[PDB]
């Protein structure tokens, strides 16, 4: 009817409301850990960056991208996809590793050949060294990424805990370390060639930090989005309520007419 279609769609809306509420709550719970993590990691990373600045480093081509397997957290998946697609116009022949099922899907549509190695089964957990290290290890062995002119990793910088701006940074390869001019004011011997360890070490350290930043933005966005979803659902509840009320009123009117029509006879 009017009544039943109003009501059933309102019921759908209700179930959705409850679910978006539920999601938002869990998102907040996860968020506290996520933000905390990102601090410790980021502080550690900055210490490494301290080397790179002073070294004056400054690096066919890698793209790495990070999201979760899990869906619904925002437009994290597709905003990141769009800035990647922009950088697939900045290098068509760049090899995409997609870390996370959702970011896998968006890029896989735009270029599927470019997807060469992809990583799944990461998104569930919060970023961890074990993951970063192994992904790095596979990235080196499988993709031989040291021979790729640069590496670029994309992640989501959590600009504010109400925003996320997708951001990228370049992982300085061993050649960069080699050819950086200040490196003698970071004296080291030929033996134990620092580029060949430092490349690999910062592959993980940069990746883990990137991962932390991304996940922190993602869970934060998930809370925000799920909250906004609940609000949007409220508006729809109210819209179907007015229709319900109008329909209810109309039933009464016809019934009153019926009583009068009867009584008059």
């Amino acid at each position: 009817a009017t009544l039943k279609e109003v009501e059933m769609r309102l019921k759908s809306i209700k179930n959705i409301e409850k679910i978006t509420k539920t999601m938002k709550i869990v998102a907040s719970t996860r968020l506290s850990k996520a933000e905390k993590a990102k601090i410790s990691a980021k502080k550690m990373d900055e210490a490494e960056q301290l080397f790179y600045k002073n070294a004056e480093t400054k690096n066919k081509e890698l793209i790495v991208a990070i999201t979760s397997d899990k869906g619904l957290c925002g437009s994290i998946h597709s905003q990141l996809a769009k800035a990647v697609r922009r950088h697939l116009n900045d290098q068509p022949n760049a090899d995409i590793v997609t870390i996370g099922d959702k970011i896998k899907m968006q890029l896989l549509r735009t270029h599927p050949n470019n997807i060469k190695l992809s990583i799944n089964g990461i998104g569930k957990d919060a970023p961890t060294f074990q993951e970063s290290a192994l992904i790095a290890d596979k990235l080196l062995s499988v993709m031989k990424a040291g021979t790729y002119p640069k590496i670029s990793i994309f992640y989501n910088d959590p600009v504010s805990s109400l925003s996320f701006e997708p951001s990228e940074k370049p992982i300085f390869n061993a050649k960069t370390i080699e050819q950086s001019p200040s490196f003698g004011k970071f004296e080291i011997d030929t033996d134990a060639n620092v580029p060949r360890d430092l490349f690999e070490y910062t592959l993980a350290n940069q990746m883990l930090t990137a991962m932390a930043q991304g996940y922190a933005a993602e869970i934060s966005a998930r809370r925000n989005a799920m909250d906004n979803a609940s609000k949007n659902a409220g508006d729809m509840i109210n819209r179907y309520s007015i229709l319900y009320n109008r329909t209810r009123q109309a039933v009464i009117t016809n019934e009153l007419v019926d009583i009068i029509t009867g009584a008059s006879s």
Binding site: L117, N120, T128, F129, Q130, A133, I135, L140, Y201
Partner: protein, 48 residues
Amino acid sequence: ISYAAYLNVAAQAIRSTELQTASVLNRSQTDAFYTQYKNASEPTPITK
């Protein structure tokens, strides 16, 4: 052995003695599948 693999095993080894927290053990585990996407078409999503 690779430098970052070397450090990785060492970090895992540190989670032994035995006084170490749950969070350490979580940092020391991953269940994943590195999905070889060679050529669009995907050779098997072999464990990571």
